[PDB]
Design a protein around this ligand. Structure first.
Ligand SMILES: [Zn+2]
Length: 117
């Protein structure tokens, strides 16, 4: 439970000292991936604050302080990340909440299979 789930942060400090653009640079990110993961990752991640941790094609945010490994279809890091959590510093700094809001939510469905649409 830690120092009171309510008097702590519902977790052992998720943000592991993020906001480290010094090493999260452009060539720093791509460099991590050692040109192995999918294509279009250069601008994709470099712009969304995603860098390679060491898994096979997986990714995580180094500027926001959160992970987003591959466990679903191709799903561009842009869409996948925004759904993972809108409270990601850099992530928002790029396409603002207007985008993340459009992503996380949906185009109109938001019914899950159909429900009542
Ligand atoms: Zn993030």
């Amino acid at each position: 439970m830690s120092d009171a789930v309510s008097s702590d942060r519902n977790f052992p400090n998720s943000t592991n000292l993020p906001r480290n653009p010094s090493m999260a640079d452009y060539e720093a990110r791509i460099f991590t991936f050692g040109t192995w993961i999918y294509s279009v990752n250069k601008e994709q991640l470099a712009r969304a604050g995603f860098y390679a941790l060491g898994e096979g094609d997986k990714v995580k945010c180094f500027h926001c302080g959160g992970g987003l490994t591959d466990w679903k279809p191709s799903e561009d890091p842009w869409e996948q990340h925004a759904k993972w959590y809108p409270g990601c510093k850099y992530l928002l700094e790029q396409k603002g909440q207007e985008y993340i809001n459009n992503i996380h939510l949906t185009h109109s469905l938001e019914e899950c299979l159909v429900r009542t649409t």
